[PDB]
Amino acid sequence: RVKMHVKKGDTVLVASGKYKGRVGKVKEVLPKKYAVIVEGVNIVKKAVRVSPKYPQGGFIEKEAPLHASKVRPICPACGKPTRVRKKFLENGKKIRVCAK
Amino acid sequence: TAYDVILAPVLSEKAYAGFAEGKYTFWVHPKATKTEIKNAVETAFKVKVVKVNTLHVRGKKKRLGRYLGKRPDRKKAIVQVAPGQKIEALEG
Amino acid sequence: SGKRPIVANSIQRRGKAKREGGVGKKTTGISKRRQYPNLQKVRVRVAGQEITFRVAASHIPKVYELVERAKGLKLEGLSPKEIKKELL
RNA sequence: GAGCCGGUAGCGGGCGUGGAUCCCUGGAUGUCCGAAUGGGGGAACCCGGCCGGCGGGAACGCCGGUCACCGCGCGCGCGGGGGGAACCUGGGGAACUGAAACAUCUCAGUACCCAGAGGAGAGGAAAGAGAAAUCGACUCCCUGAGUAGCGGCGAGCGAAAGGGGACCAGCCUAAACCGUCCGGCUUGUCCGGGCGGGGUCGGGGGCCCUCGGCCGAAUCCCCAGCCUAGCCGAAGCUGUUGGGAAGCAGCGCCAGAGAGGGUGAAAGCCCCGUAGGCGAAAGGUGGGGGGAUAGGUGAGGGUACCCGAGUACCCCGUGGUUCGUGGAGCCAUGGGGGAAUCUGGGCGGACCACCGCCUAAGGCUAAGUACUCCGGGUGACCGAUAGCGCACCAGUACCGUGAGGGAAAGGUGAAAAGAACCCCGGGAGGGGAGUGAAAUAGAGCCUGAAACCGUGGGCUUACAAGCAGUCACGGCCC
RNA sequence: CGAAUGCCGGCAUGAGUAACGAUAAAGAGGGUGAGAAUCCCUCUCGCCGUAAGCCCAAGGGUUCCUACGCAAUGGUCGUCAGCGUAGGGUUAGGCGGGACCUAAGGUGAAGCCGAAAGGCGUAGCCGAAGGGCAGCCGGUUAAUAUUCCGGCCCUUCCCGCA
RNA sequence: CCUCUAAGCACAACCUGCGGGAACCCGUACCGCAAACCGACACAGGUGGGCGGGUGCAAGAGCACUCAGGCGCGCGGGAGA
Ligand SMILES: [Mg+2]
Ligand SMILES: [Mg+2]
Ligand SMILES: [Mg+2]
Ligand SMILES: [Mg+2]
Ligand SMILES: [Mg+2]
Ligand SMILES: [Mg+2]
Ligand SMILES: [Mg+2]
Ligand SMILES: [Mg+2]
Ligand SMILES: [Mg+2]
Ligand SMILES: [Mg+2]
Ligand SMILES: [Mg+2]
Ligand SMILES: [Mg+2]
Ligand SMILES: [Mg+2]
Ligand SMILES: [Mg+2]
Ligand SMILES: [Mg+2]
Ligand SMILES: [Mg+2]
Ligand SMILES: [Mg+2]
Ligand SMILES: [Mg+2]
Ligand SMILES: [Mg+2]
Ligand SMILES: [Mg+2]
Ligand SMILES: [Mg+2]
Ligand SMILES: [Mg+2]
Ligand SMILES: [Mg+2]
Ligand SMILES: [Mg+2]
Ligand SMILES: [Mg+2]
Ligand SMILES: [Mg+2]
Ligand SMILES: [Mg+2]
Ligand SMILES: [Mg+2]
Ligand SMILES: [Mg+2]
Ligand SMILES: [Mg+2]
Ligand SMILES: [Mg+2]
Ligand SMILES: [Mg+2]
Ligand SMILES: [Mg+2]
Ligand SMILES: [Mg+2]
Ligand SMILES: [Mg+2]
Ligand SMILES: [Mg+2]
Ligand SMILES: [Mg+2]
Ligand SMILES: [Mg+2]
Ligand SMILES: [Mg+2]
Ligand SMILES: [Mg+2]
Ligand SMILES: [Mg+2]
Ligand SMILES: [Mg+2]
Ligand SMILES: [Mg+2]
Ligand SMILES: [Mg+2]
Ligand SMILES: [Mg+2]
Ligand SMILES: [Mg+2]
Ligand SMILES: [Mg+2]
Ligand SMILES: [Mg+2]
Ligand SMILES: [Mg+2]
Ligand SMILES: [Mg+2]
Ligand SMILES: [Mg+2]
Ligand SMILES: [Mg+2]
Ligand SMILES: [Mg+2]
Ligand SMILES: [Mg+2]
Ligand SMILES: [Mg+2]
Ligand SMILES: [Mg+2]
Ligand SMILES: [Mg+2]
Ligand SMILES: [Mg+2]
Ligand SMILES: [Mg+2]
Ligand SMILES: [Mg+2]
Ligand SMILES: [Mg+2]
Ligand SMILES: [Mg+2]
Ligand SMILES: [Mg+2]
Ligand SMILES: [Mg+2]
Ligand SMILES: [Mg+2]
Ligand SMILES: [Mg+2]
Ligand SMILES: [Mg+2]
Ligand SMILES: [Mg+2]
Ligand SMILES: [Mg+2]
Ligand SMILES: [Mg+2]
Ligand SMILES: [Mg+2]
Ligand SMILES: [Mg+2]
Ligand SMILES: [Mg+2]
Ligand SMILES: [Mg+2]
Ligand SMILES: [Mg+2]
Ligand SMILES: [Mg+2]
Ligand SMILES: [Mg+2]
Ligand SMILES: [Mg+2]
Ligand SMILES: [Mg+2]
Ligand SMILES: [Mg+2]
Ligand SMILES: [Mg+2]
Ligand SMILES: [Mg+2]
Ligand SMILES: [Mg+2]
Ligand SMILES: [Mg+2]
Ligand SMILES: [Mg+2]
Ligand SMILES: [Mg+2]
Ligand SMILES: [Mg+2]
Ligand SMILES: [Mg+2]
Ligand SMILES: [Mg+2]
Ligand SMILES: [Mg+2]
Ligand SMILES: [Mg+2]
Ligand SMILES: [Mg+2]
Ligand SMILES: [Mg+2]
Ligand SMILES: [Mg+2]
Ligand SMILES: [Mg+2]
Ligand SMILES: [Mg+2]
Ligand SMILES: [Mg+2]
Ligand SMILES: [Mg+2]
Ligand SMILES: [Mg+2]
Ligand SMILES: [Mg+2]
Ligand SMILES: [Mg+2]
Ligand SMILES: [Mg+2]
Ligand SMILES: [Mg+2]
Ligand SMILES: [Mg+2]
Ligand SMILES: [Mg+2]
Ligand SMILES: [Mg+2]
Ligand SMILES: [Mg+2]
Ligand SMILES: [Mg+2]
Ligand SMILES: [Mg+2]
Ligand SMILES: [Mg+2]
Ligand SMILES: [Mg+2]
Ligand SMILES: [Mg+2]
Ligand SMILES: [Mg+2]
């Protein structure tokens, strides 16, 4: 509904914060909190588990949601918002112009 | 609507003692809930059930609201002496 | 009371007075209470077969007009419905 | 059109670009109670009958139908029954109040109860209004007008005409007569009963021979359009302090879009959007647009046929209208007397005579108007004691037998990164470590005042007296 | 905003003060536990014993029982609890009700009367710790037991045979 | 329950035994003179029925003690105004 947004599980630039400009991979959309996770915010989760298994070695702990109004998608371009081209039967996301 | 009656058995330390005389107490569908579910247990487990009893159990609970699940009827078969079968002896 | 061929009863005020009255001298009123003027009602008995009405007794000639009839039908036992719906 | 399996956080369990999750529309299943409707019932439960189905079985079972009561027509069938925040009509209908007491009166035909009805209801086509050789249905709004009036002529209540507007529309029925038909009888070339045909101030109609003649529904199928999902929707990059930029600066760009929200803050150009423009297979919806149907086309002159009956009119009793008995008409009508059908009948405010007006005792009739449970937007509307009583799991907890009353209770941060690991402790709670920009932002956690309660420091008091202060000096740490 | 014996919220003071809810009454030794007069056990002591003991209805509803707990509730403490968490637990042809009956009283076809709501009311139906109806004794787990089981007996119905 | 006949059936229908079968819904835990009911309280109050032992005093559901059973009343320790 309103909950649909920029893009889906592809590679995408983030222009947010500390990671102002970082091309991350496939992004794993959240989106009820309107975020993705993609590759940027990598903050440490100081948690054991809920089920006590394979205990604490190091923390290379996982990512964070990264609110999705700052993940600029990519094509042979940089940024350039998505658009809709329909071609009489489909609905494809073509950027401000390069292609694709 | 014959296998929508016998809802579930109960693993319990009392209904492990049902295998010495009289086969195990199932939670039955607490409405449409007759003691003549003998043709709901022998049509399900291919036995010849002599006697069935009946109940009404399982009241309240906290965490903000009441009635722990349901109030489901549950009872048994006093099925004929050793047609007691149908792999039930697992867990007890 | 009832209706059977007419409209139901009404509600009146009373309007007492204690005076001389205008064409003599000064007038007045006293107390405006609700007399409840139940209309004139008479159980009338006619011989369709045994039929009974609560008719208004300014309408007893009207129910005899309703009886001076032959509405083509025999007895179900009670039948004032066909006498009152074949009224005009 | 790529993520989902609701408010999921956890079992990990699956499911999706051969189309899911969702949203809308149409079905299906809808247990039980409830108008409850098979009967009973202390609602959510019991107990049935008939038919059809599973030693699953003839007995107890369960399934799926059907079994209330009332109203309308010919055992047979179509409706009704209850609910709804207000809105409306009718039947009833107070009292506190005000009169500076109070009874008439007012409050008030208000509140409330009951019935009814629907998206509206009401009313409605003149037996009208009242001064004009006039207006021409009804309703609503503004004027009229606080006028005319009513009024213990006190308190107060208070029109209507006219005139501006909105809206617009007129019609069916015995305004008799002909045939039909169960039977009525004194078989009557005829009584009333159902239809049917006639009938609506070439003043009306029916009947008697000139002169022949289609407008258009409120009703019906249609179609836009409207909703009920949505969709496409323009254009900004870099550097900078920073936790973070959109802030600042430079170089731009869109604009039928510079409404707003969120984005780590201050974003026209990141997102959602907005301007603008598309979109309905399915259902509701709707002459707004055109289509047909149903209906409408004794103009004449006559033989006095018919123009709605216990009704009009008169009296008694009252209500309504401005009208409280008054000079009391009118409109309704509870009692009593009781007519005529156009040289009829009513009205024009006692009444009477002229002059007018208009046809009662049968019914329907859109539209404009009131309303706001509902959906949307709008705010010199509120921002958690406010706004609804409820921003939150609230008509809840709690109180009450009951009707009923009826609360409080929002905010971590950008993101849970919601504190791994130690150490004390039984744990709670801490102290480290860690997170984060910030942790006296650490979890019912933003800011977090004051009352209050502590701890540390300065001055000060144990021969003092006071509405606690103030002025004056003096002493002592800043 | 300073007053309304104002309202809502907070915190005082009273105050470590009155009380702690029966003048039936406690004492000790072991446990358990981090911690104990309060929990468990033992051994005395006391108290009721026409109850302060058992059983059933009324009512309350899971308080029952077991295990993990102790912030909260226990007028103290608490390892305990009836409190929190989770899991178990209530078995009936014979007990009590309904597939039976009526009493008062409801409801109520018919019928009556009311402006409407509705008020009556015959039959009928509902209506119960009253009538009627077939059960006694023992054991078992942590909880149920006239229900489970063991013995003996009995009742209704339906079918078949005589 | 016993009985008599109407309707009806007298190829039924009841009755007595003997064989088999079927026996449904709800209640059932626990407290129940109380810390679990009613009194805002683990409240000295209220609460219906049944059993309510023994010995003694003339009897007794009294009273005194005490079986069985159940409690010491969910604050105590002092001191001796
Ligand atoms: Mg498609
Ligand atoms: Mg049972
Ligand atoms: Mg509980
Ligand atoms: Mg007067
Ligand atoms: Mg009055
Ligand atoms: Mg008479
Ligand atoms: Mg889910
Ligand atoms: Mg699909
Ligand atoms: Mg699907
Ligand atoms: Mg769905
Ligand atoms: Mg089905
Ligand atoms: Mg029913
Ligand atoms: Mg009933
Ligand atoms: Mg019931
Ligand atoms: Mg078969
Ligand atoms: Mg069969
Ligand atoms: Mg049925
Ligand atoms: Mg029809
Ligand atoms: Mg209704
Ligand atoms: Mg008054
Ligand atoms: Mg007064
Ligand atoms: Mg007075
Ligand atoms: Mg008035
Ligand atoms: Mg209308
Ligand atoms: Mg009308
Ligand atoms: Mg007219
Ligand atoms: Mg006006
Ligand atoms: Mg006018
Ligand atoms: Mg006008
Ligand atoms: Mg017109
Ligand atoms: Mg005739
Ligand atoms: Mg006609
Ligand atoms: Mg002629
Ligand atoms: Mg069309
Ligand atoms: Mg179109
Ligand atoms: Mg849409
Ligand atoms: Mg778009
Ligand atoms: Mg855009
Ligand atoms: Mg900065
Ligand atoms: Mg902003
Ligand atoms: Mg901020
Ligand atoms: Mg913005
Ligand atoms: Mg648009
Ligand atoms: Mg359509
Ligand atoms: Mg279509
Ligand atoms: Mg319509
Ligand atoms: Mg007329
Ligand atoms: Mg007369
Ligand atoms: Mg007159
Ligand atoms: Mg006067
Ligand atoms: Mg004349
Ligand atoms: Mg007239
Ligand atoms: Mg006139
Ligand atoms: Mg007159
Ligand atoms: Mg005049
Ligand atoms: Mg209308
Ligand atoms: Mg209007
Ligand atoms: Mg809204
Ligand atoms: Mg404000
Ligand atoms: Mg605001
Ligand atoms: Mg608040
Ligand atoms: Mg509030
Ligand atoms: Mg606040
Ligand atoms: Mg709530
Ligand atoms: Mg209560
Ligand atoms: Mg935040
Ligand atoms: Mg800790
Ligand atoms: Mg705080
Ligand atoms: Mg704070
Ligand atoms: Mg100090
Ligand atoms: Mg001195
Ligand atoms: Mg001194
Ligand atoms: Mg002095
Ligand atoms: Mg104050
Ligand atoms: Mg004052
Ligand atoms: Mg003041
Ligand atoms: Mg206070
Ligand atoms: Mg205090
Ligand atoms: Mg003192
Ligand atoms: Mg003291
Ligand atoms: Mg004391
Ligand atoms: Mg003693
Ligand atoms: Mg003793
Ligand atoms: Mg226990
Ligand atoms: Mg504590
Ligand atoms: Mg405590
Ligand atoms: Mg322990
Ligand atoms: Mg517990
Ligand atoms: Mg038995
Ligand atoms: Mg019995
Ligand atoms: Mg039954
Ligand atoms: Mg009965
Ligand atoms: Mg009786
Ligand atoms: Mg009655
Ligand atoms: Mg009956
Ligand atoms: Mg009984
Ligand atoms: Mg009895
Ligand atoms: Mg027990
Ligand atoms: Mg028991
Ligand atoms: Mg015996
Ligand atoms: Mg059986
Ligand atoms: Mg028991
Ligand atoms: Mg007792
Ligand atoms: Mg007790
Ligand atoms: Mg209590
Ligand atoms: Mg009290
Ligand atoms: Mg106590
Ligand atoms: Mg007590
Ligand atoms: Mg007593
Ligand atoms: Mg003695
Ligand atoms: Mg005694
Ligand atoms: Mg105590
Ligand atoms: Mg003493």
DSSP letters, A20-75, are EEEEE-------TTSB---SS---------SS--S--S---------BTTSEEE-S
Number of Cβ within 10 Å of residue A92's Cβ equals: 11
Q: DSSP secondary-structure letter at C10?
A: -
Number of Cβ within 10 Å of residue C78's Cβ equals: 10
- What resolution in angstroms does the PDB record give? 3.7
In whole angstroms, D14 C1' to C82 CA is 73
Q: Name the residue with tokens 């569908």.
A: B29
Helices within chain C (DSSP H only) = 60-67, 81-84
Under 8 Å CB-to-CB from C88, ≥6 apart: which residues? none
- Is B38 within 7 A of strand E by CB distance? no
The residues facing B28 across adjacent strands are B6
CA dist list (Å): C43 to B10, C46, C57: 75, 10, 9
Which nt has its C1' nearest the CA of B59? E62
Q: In whole angstroms, what is the distance from residue A11 CA to residue A77 CA?
A: 12
- Is B2 within 7 A of strand E by CB distance? no
- Is B38 within 7 A of strand F by CB distance? yes
User: How many whole angstroms from B51 Cα to the centroid of ligand 97?
Assistant: 29
Q: How far is CA C64 from the centre of its chain?
A: 15
> What is the C-alpha end-to-end distance of chain B, expressed in Å?
29
SS3 assignment, position B26: strand
Contact B7, B57 (CB under 8 A): no
Q: In whole angstroms, what is the distance from residue A12 CA to residue A38 CA?
A: 8
Contact C58, C50 (CB under 8 A): no
In whole angstroms, D386 C1' to A44 CA is 43
Q: In whole angstroms, what is the distance from residue B79 CA to residue A86 CA?
A: 69
Reported as type and span, the H/E element at residue C43 is strand C42-45
Q: Which experiment gave this structure?
A: cryo-EM
Which bases in strand F are touched by protein, i.e. have an atom under 7 Å from a CB? 22-28
Q: Name the residue with tokens 């509600």.
A: C11
Q: In whole angstroms, what is the distance from residue B34 CA to residue B5 CA?
A: 10
Q: In whole angstroms, what is the distance from residue A68 CA to residue A29 CA?
A: 9
Contact A43, A33 (CB under 8 A): no
Handedness of CA A74, A77, A79, A80 (dihedral sign): negative
Buried b / exposed e over C29-65, threshold 16 CB at 10 Å, is eeeeeeeeeeeebeebebebeebebebbeebeeebee
Q: In whole angstroms, what is the distance from residue C70 CA to residue C44 CA?
A: 19
CA dist list (Å): A40 to A14, A43, C66: 7, 9, 99
Largest Cα separation within chain A, whole Å, is 56
Contact A94, A85 (CB under 8 A): yes
Contact C35, C13 (CB under 8 A): yes
A39: amino acid identity, one letter: E
CA dist list (Å): C42 to A16, A79, C23, C39: 97, 98, 40, 10
- Is B54 within 7 A of strand F by CB distance? yes
Taking ligand 2, which is a single-atom ion, which protein residues have CB atoms under 5 Å away?
A: B 54
The residues facing A67 across adjacent strands are A35
- Is A15 within 7 A of strand D by CB distance? yes
User: How many whole angstroms from B64 Cα to the centroid of ligand 67?
Assistant: 27
Q: Name the residue with tokens 């070695």.
A: A57
